[PDB]
Amino acid sequence: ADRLIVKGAREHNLRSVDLDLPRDALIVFTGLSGSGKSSLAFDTIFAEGQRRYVESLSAYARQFLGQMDKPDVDFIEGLSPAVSIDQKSTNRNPRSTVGTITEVYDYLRLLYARAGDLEPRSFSFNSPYGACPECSGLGCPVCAGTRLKPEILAVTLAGESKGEHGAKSIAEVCELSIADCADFLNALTLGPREQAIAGQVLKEIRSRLGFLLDVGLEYLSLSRAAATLSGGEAQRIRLATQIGSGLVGVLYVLDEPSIGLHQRDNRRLIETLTRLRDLGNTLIVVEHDEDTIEHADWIVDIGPGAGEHGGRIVHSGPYDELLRNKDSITGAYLSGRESIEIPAIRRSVDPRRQLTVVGAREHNLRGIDVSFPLGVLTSVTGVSGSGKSTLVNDILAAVLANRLNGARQVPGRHTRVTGLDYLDKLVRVDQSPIGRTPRSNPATYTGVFDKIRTLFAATTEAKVRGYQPGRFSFNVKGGRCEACTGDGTIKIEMNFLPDVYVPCEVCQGARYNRETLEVHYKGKTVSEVLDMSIEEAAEFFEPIAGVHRYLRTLVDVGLGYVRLGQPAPTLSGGEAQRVKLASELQKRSTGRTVYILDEPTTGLHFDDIRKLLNVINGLVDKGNTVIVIEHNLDVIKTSDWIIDLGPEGGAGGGTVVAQGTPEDVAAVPASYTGKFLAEVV
Amino acid sequence: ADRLIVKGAREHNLRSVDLDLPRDALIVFTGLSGSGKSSLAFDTIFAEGQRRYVESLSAYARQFLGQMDKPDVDFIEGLSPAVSIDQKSTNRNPRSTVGTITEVYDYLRLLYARAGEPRSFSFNSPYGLKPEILAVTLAGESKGEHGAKSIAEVCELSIADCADFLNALTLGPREQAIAGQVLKEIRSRLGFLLDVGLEYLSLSRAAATLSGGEAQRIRLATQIGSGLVGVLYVLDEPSIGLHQRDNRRLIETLTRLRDLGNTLIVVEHDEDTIEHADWIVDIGPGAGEHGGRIVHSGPYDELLRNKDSITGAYLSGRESIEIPAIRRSVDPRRQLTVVGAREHNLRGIDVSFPLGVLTSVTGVSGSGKSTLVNDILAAVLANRLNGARQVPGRHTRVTGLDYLDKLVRVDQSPIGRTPRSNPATYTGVFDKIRTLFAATTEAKVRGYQPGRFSFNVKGGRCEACTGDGTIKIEMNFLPDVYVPCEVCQGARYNRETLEVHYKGKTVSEVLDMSIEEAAEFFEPIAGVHRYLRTLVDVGLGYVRLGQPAPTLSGGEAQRVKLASELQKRSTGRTVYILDEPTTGLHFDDIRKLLNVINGLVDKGNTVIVIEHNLDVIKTSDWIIDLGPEGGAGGGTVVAQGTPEDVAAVPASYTGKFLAEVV
Ligand SMILES: [Zn+2]
Ligand SMILES: [Zn+2]
Ligand SMILES: [Zn+2]
């Protein structure tokens, strides 16, 4: 029976949903932000699917797996081992490059060991043999950037230098040059009788190289540090690795593969996915992308709204069935019932109020000078990896924070920045998590927790118990649980699989001892008002106007489903970005202040995008300058000023392909973004 | 394509063989013992599959997987998740019962919690068998006990109906709605346990109170209960320790597992398994250097038509093991009879053993035949004939015992737990070879003593491996493995000792070289010639002379002990005890070992052996059947006498199978 049949998912907001899906099909999960799509996708399905097989690895593995909490499920049928790919894995290992994680570099070491003598364990910078002494293999002037020892950089296939620019293939930036060199120039160097001994090696190499080419990663160097890799890039090289693995029948759960992906690469990505299912695998992807939804064999919609309203199932069937189903906001958006109108009136670009950066020579950027209107919604486009985030984050944000906020951070290579007197302060709405500990949470982060604790101290139960606001603070020893030390959870080292939390055993996750919870304000204790969400907190804290100011903004930004007592690590990057944005909304919007956005459309439904654009429109209407980097066509057609980068990524590109209003960008044919925009505008 | 493809398999015996097999089919490896069946199957396909799929685990996994040696294979594709069920893993876990391993125990705990807390029902929690939990009753039968009566005493069938079907009609609507799925899972798992023919045993029996085959059967029952699709399963002679009646039932279980969506590869000498095999692959003729090839690859009929396959000849009728037309006379006066064997399930029966004759022990598995034969008989015989002080099983006494000189217990246990022991060390030729090497011009001009050439003596052995030839590096998630020492490259010696050459041969050279070629090599040396002749006769020629003890199978170790005791004067009377020597032996191997045993008994000696192989039984002149079933139901003599005596008796299942031959 080639069908996956499940019953009784109840993870967070799931009312025991029962599902049945055909095997070896393109399954897409969709819903509003926080509708539980991630729940079904990962927690209910992949956890069980992986763990069932991981038990079979050994008897000892079952013992090490028994300590975690099995998902709240009724029954599952037709299960097979599954592999998940996500952006959560962003290693910042100093001795890690692209070649190390791909493990392709070690294979080139093997090839140079055999062909060409040469041997591995001496080319590897992770070991002192290949580690240059002045940098410990990290990459110091003595090593001349190339982390390997100079002798290793010198030895070759009887030539001049397989090093000082990578080993003739690593620091080689574009994978096109690497592939051409290794496949043709290096292959023919061997002697009369080496075909039968190295052709299989070359075939193993170039197949993997073609795999990296297919996923659209033909630009970045193999010697780039892993810290310089985004979450989307990590998801991409993971996808390439699993494509090259060659296993058949494994399930795969994906979380928006098109993150940070230019509009041009969508069809190529779809092509790379389709052949994987043609092998005999099955794909389940959470997406808001129209094309992938159209090409998907099956679509499973999820309960309307998020949180309590979400967690249901709206649709389960073909794309036409989803379009017929009117209960799906996604279906309405796709079939045309819902859309976002292009603003007929665009904010006028001010030639005088014009920020400009000159001579940005950092990395692949060719010292280009770009001007940005002030007080007008402006967007930055361009193909993936063209360094569009590079100049912005390294140079512009750093300089603006140095000169306006007084921050001490080193900017990238550039000459200088014009003006800047037209704005008051820098706003950097990053996508990094709010906090790295369960102690940090939206209540403490936004400071509302202080107001709640002070109000709690001003209650009858607290004043008769002599409980200070600190007694209601899980962060301090006062009132917190003696086992969870206020976290409410205990982190457990899990040896090979990614690390997981377990709930506290004394307070059962209350973050407090039972004595502190005896206080009640409006019938809610500290914990009771803690786990109760912001959307239902809006009506609960209406009398407290000061606290109401925060929750109003968190409601406006569309985060009703989120929990105040939800730990910061459990919050996604986009959710943390929204938390920072709404906290900034809990301020006095000056007439002039620059707002910086980094792909805010992450993990948002079309209605969520329409909600957030309404929020940001008011902010721009304050005369404030807003800048955002995006690949979504709707925000491109909505913004009044758009500047395209490229036309290539990495070393190729780094120049201004086009700029101007959406009409201006669509007029330019050299801009791929303009090519996709002309179809709409 | 749904076809496994293999190229360039060279590890150990393999001579760069290339394979191509269908997927989701039952394929059986066959050949002579040591032809390369176990090596080729496990070491290449299972190792490759498991290693490759563990590479798809996490970043921390790969760095710890790169340490072990990659297989000597070129080009294999069509790979799928790997699971092996073998008899190697004999866990000693004191707090592990049958139910816990098969995970049904958790289901019973949950069911009794919902119909009485499952954690309070287990012995691994401070809440919980303690007497207070025994007060909880689910009276599906007249008796309601959470394992106190169900798991403790009544075996698979009885616990099954009493706690799954009797209470299936005494369950209230709330208990039904709350635990029906759990009870149904219990029923399905118990049915699977019934199918594999493990019905005889109770489920509270200790984990350690099992054989390797019993542990293997628990393992494959767990694999049945896992419910995964698309995983190939490799089996290592599951028919061991299993009655021929259960053979077809086990075949049914494997066929249902394959129909579930899996593929199966089994190395077996069983005729029934070969006949039931969808595909059969034969391996190069002979063992050792002679093997390592491919003879047949196709249907069973193709193997029959293949005249180059010894297994093909045996199955086609060209080769067979013939019943001895003349049997040794049973002497009623020479008769050793135990009395009152109350140990385990044995119901105090008295069993008479004829002397100066070939006798085999039969009966369905688990009926305590091993219990009696080892615990009572072997311990008593070692106490009185060898003087060893070991406690025998519960019995009264044994008649006679004055008709034999000493006990010869040939156990299947491995020769040694460490590479410190090799065949040369065990058989004693290591002293002779060391003295011979010291008696050379190179050794005497180097001032080298016999101990210099020893790997257990510091002088001469490698300073890193101390003569082991390998270094152990711990494996975190997978079982620990050995990687050879790089200082000596596994030579177990420093290079300063390897310059000595007797007949132009160094210590490591003659160590690696097998006894098969050592037979002609040490022909002038008659003293070592007797030893090598005994190994050749027993059938260990293809084994490496210096092969480490851990790299030796149980049957090979038993054969090594048999040859070592064959390096002795076979008296007119001495008892030999055997424990299923058929393990890992082709029909021709069975025939030659039968010739060896016939020669041994022809010295007037008395030999006893436990077996399920019909050829061994039919050759045996005297047979005594145990039964009627295994476990507590059983432990009584169903029949005894000549092969015709047992075959005539229909109550004897072994007699039922023998009546077909006789
Ligand atoms: Zn250096
Ligand atoms: Zn706690
Ligand atoms: Zn060594």
DSSP A68-109: SPPPS-SEEES---EEEE-TT-----TT-BHHHHHSHHHHHH
Phi, psi of B83 (to 5 degrees): -140, 130
- Among chain B residues, the shortest Cα distance to A498 is held by B58
A284: alpha, beta or left, given left = phi > 0 and alpha = psi -120 to 50?
beta
Burial of A668 (0-12, 13-18, 19+ CB in 10 A): middle
Which among B361, B319, B432 is positioned nearest to B582, based on CA atoms? B361
Burial of A273 (0-12, 13-18, 19+ CB in 10 A): buried
Beta bridge partners of A616: none
Q: Which residue is associated with the tokens 């021929």?
A: B244
- Give me the residue from B57, B75, B227 closest to A496, CB to CB: B57
Closest Cα in chain A, distance from residue B79 (Å)? 6
Helices (H) and strands (E) in chain A, counts: 26, 20
Beta bridge partners of A298: A27
d(CA B322, CA B366): 29
In chain B, which residues have their Cβ closer than 8 Å to the Cβ of A83? 56
Distances (CA, A) of A509 to A285, A514, A533, A643, B387: 32, 11, 16, 49, 66
A459–chain B Cβ distance below 8 A for any pair: no
In chain B, which residues have their Cβ closer than 8 Å to the Cβ of A23? none
In chain A, which residues have their Cβ closer than 8 Å to the Cβ of B477? 57-58, 60-61, 495-496
Query: Encoding tokens for residue A353?
Result: 């109020």
The 3 state secondary structure assigned to A373-440 is ECCCEEEECCCCCCCHHHHHHHHHHHHHHHHHHCCCCCCCCCCEECCCCCCCCEEEECCCCCCCCCCC
Burial of A25 (0-12, 13-18, 19+ CB in 10 A): middle
Q: Which helix (H) or strand (E) segment is B544 a member of?
A: none
- Name all domains of chain B by residue range, CATH numbers in brackets: 1-89+211-320 (3.40.50.300), 90-210 (1.20.1580.10), 321-413+553-662 (3.40.50.300), 414-552 (1.20.1580.10)
Q: Which amino acid is at A639?
A: S
d(CA A553, CA A674): 35
Q: Which residues surround ligand 3, an ion (CB under 5 A)?
A: B 462, 464-465, 485, 487-488
B357: alpha, beta or left, given left = phi > 0 and alpha = psi -120 to 50?
beta
d(CA B614, CA B321): 10
Alpha helices, DSSP H, located in A215-346? 231-245, 266-279, 290-295, 319-324, 329-335
Query: Encoding tokens for residue A392?
Result: 């912005």
Phi, psi of A536 (to 5 degrees): -80, -15
d(CA A550, CA A544): 11
Inter-helix orientation angle B212-226/B173-195, to 10°: 130
d(CA A60, CA A14): 33
User: Does residue B628 have a cis peptide bond before it, meaning omega lies within 30 degrees of 0?
Assistant: yes
Which among B236, B201, B159 is positioned nearest to B368, based on CA atoms? B201
Pairing of strands A416-417, A354-360: antiparallel
Cα dihedral B127/B132/B133/B137 (nearest 10): -160
Is A32 annotated for ligand binding? yes
A558: alpha, beta or left, given left = phi > 0 and alpha = psi -120 to 50?
left
Query: Encoding tokens for residue A371?
Result: 């001007």
Beta bridge partners of B514: B544
In chain B, which residues have their Cβ closer than 8 Å to the Cβ of A78? 229
Task: Return residues 204-243 of B near A (CB < 8 Å).
Answer: 223, 226-231
With an 8 Å Cβ cutoff, are B228 and A75 in contact?
no
The 3 state secondary structure assigned to A393-405 is HHHHHHHHHHHHH
Rg (CA), chain B: 27
CB–CB of B29/B281 below 8 Å? yes
Q: Which residue is associated with the tokens 């004939």?
A: B385
d(CA B145, CA A148): 70
**Ligand having the closest approach to the CA of B494:** 3
Closest Cα in chain A, distance from residue B500 (Å)? 32
d(CA A641, CA A636): 9
Is A35 annotated for ligand binding? yes
Q: Which amino acid is at B153?
A: E
- Give me the residue from B54, B58, B62 closest to A498, CB to CB: B58
Q: Tell me the resolution in Å.
A: 4.9
Count other Cβ atoms within 10 Å, centred on residue A360.
25
d(CA B26, CA B406): 47
Which among B343, B342, B341, B344 is positioned nearest to B352, based on CA atoms? B341
Q: Which amino acid is at B298?
A: G
d(CA B191, CA B181): 15
CB–CB of B497/B460 below 8 Å? yes
Interface test with A, best of B58, B216, B232, B474 (most A CBs within 10 A): B58
User: Does residue B131 have a cis peptide bond before it, meaning omega lies within 30 degrees of 0?
Assistant: no
Beta bridge partners of A85: A254
Query: Encoding tokens for residue B139?
Result: 């009276």
**Ligand having the closest approach to the CA of B419:** 3
Beta bridge partners of A282: A251
Going from the Cα of A652 to the center of ligand 1, the distance in angstroms, rounded, reads 28
Is A488 annotated for ligand binding? no
- Give me the residue from B61, B81, B91 closest to A496, CB to CB: B61
In chain B, which residues have their Cβ closer than 8 Å to the Cβ of A56? 81, 83, 223, 226, 228, 231
Could you tell me how far CA B340 lies from the centroid of its own chain? 31
d(CA B156, CA B203): 7
Task: Return residues 67-86 of A near B (CB < 8 Å).
Answer: 74-75, 78-81, 83
Task: Return residues 242-261 of A near B (CB < 8 Å).
Answer: 242, 245-250
Burial of B524 (0-12, 13-18, 19+ CB in 10 A): exposed
Query: Encoding tokens for residue A394?
Result: 């390294």
DSSP state of A117: -
Interface test with B, best of A248, A253, A500 (most B CBs within 10 A): A248
User: The sheet that has A3-9: what strands, in order across it?
Assistant: A17-22, A3-9, A75-77
Q: Which residue is associated with the tokens 């040896």?
A: A495
Which among B438, B341, B476, B658 is positioned nearest to B68, based on CA atoms? B476
With an 8 Å Cβ cutoff, are A79 and B477 in contact?
no
CB–CB of B538/B559 below 8 Å? yes
CB–CB of B178/B132 below 8 Å? no
Count other Cβ atoms within 10 Å, centred on residue B658.
25
Phi, psi of B6 (to 5 degrees): -135, 135
Experimental method: cryo-EM
B54–chain A Cβ distance below 8 A for any pair: yes
Query: Encoding tokens for residue B261?
Result: 């969506």
d(CA A36, CA A13): 7
DSSP track, B294-312: EEEEE-HHHHHH-TT-HHH
Q: Which residues contact A17 (CB under 8 A, 6 or more apart)?
A: A8, A9, A40, A311, A312, A313
- At B102 the three-state DSSP class reads helix
A59–chain B Cβ distance below 8 A for any pair: yes
Inter-helix orientation angle A195-214/A266-279, to 10°: 130
Q: Which helix (H) or strand (E) segment is B105 a member of?
A: helix B104-115
Burial of A41 (0-12, 13-18, 19+ CB in 10 A): buried
In chain A, which residues have their Cβ closer than 8 Å to the Cβ of B89? 59
Going from the Cα of A510 to the center of ligand 2, the distance in angstroms, rounded, reads 6
Q: Which amino acid is at B269?
A: H
Going from the Cα of B628 to the center of ligand 2, the distance in angstroms, rounded, reads 60
* Number of A–B residue contacts, CB under 8 Å: 69
Burial of B130 (0-12, 13-18, 19+ CB in 10 A): exposed
With an 8 Å Cβ cutoff, are A79 and B478 in contact?
no
- Give me the residue from B79, B229, B477 closest to A78, CB to CB: B229
Which among A536, A663, A568, A561 is positioned nearest to A611, based on CA atoms? A561
With an 8 Å Cβ cutoff, are B228 and A91 in contact?
no
Which among B634, B615, B90, B14 is positioned nearest to B360, based on CA atoms? B615
With an 8 Å Cβ cutoff, are B228 and A497 in contact?
no
d(CA A330, CA B272): 59
Q: Which helix (H) or strand (E) segment is B424 a member of?
A: helix B423-427
d(CA B108, CA B118): 8
Which among B149, B144, B95, B142 is positioned nearest to B122, based on CA atoms? B95
d(CA B42, CA B305): 27
Helices (H) and strands (E) in chain B, counts: 26, 19
Which among A283, A253, A307, A298 is positioned nearest to A86, based on CA atoms? A253
Phi, psi of B480 (to 5 degrees): -65, 145
Going from the Cα of A124 to the center of ligand 1, the distance in angstroms, rounded, reads 13
Distances (CA, A) of A593 to A118, A289, A642, B480: 58, 33, 19, 62
With an 8 Å Cβ cutoff, are A57 and B81 in contact?
no
A89–chain B Cβ distance below 8 A for any pair: yes
CB–CB of A173/A648 below 8 Å? no
Q: Which amino acid is at B460?
A: G
Q: Can you say whether the dihedral through the CA atoms of A90, A94, A98, A100 is positive or negative?
A: negative
CB–CB of A88/A235 below 8 Å? no
Spell out a b/e string for A207-236, using b for 16 or more CB atoms within 10 Å of the CB, else e: ebbebbbbbbbbbbbbbbbbeebbbbbbbb
Going from the Cα of A514 to the center of ligand 2, the distance in angstroms, rounded, reads 10
d(CA B268, CA A217): 50
Angle formed at CA A426 by CA A421 and CA A428, multiple of 5 degrees: 155
Query: Encoding tokens for residue B424?
Result: 């040369």
Going from the Cα of B494 to the center of ligand 3, the distance in angstroms, rounded, reads 7
d(CA A197, CA A182): 16
CB–CB of B630/B641 below 8 Å? no
Going from the Cα of A105 to the center of ligand 1, the distance in angstroms, rounded, reads 19
Which among B384, B356, B387, B351 is positioned nearest to B369, based on CA atoms? B351
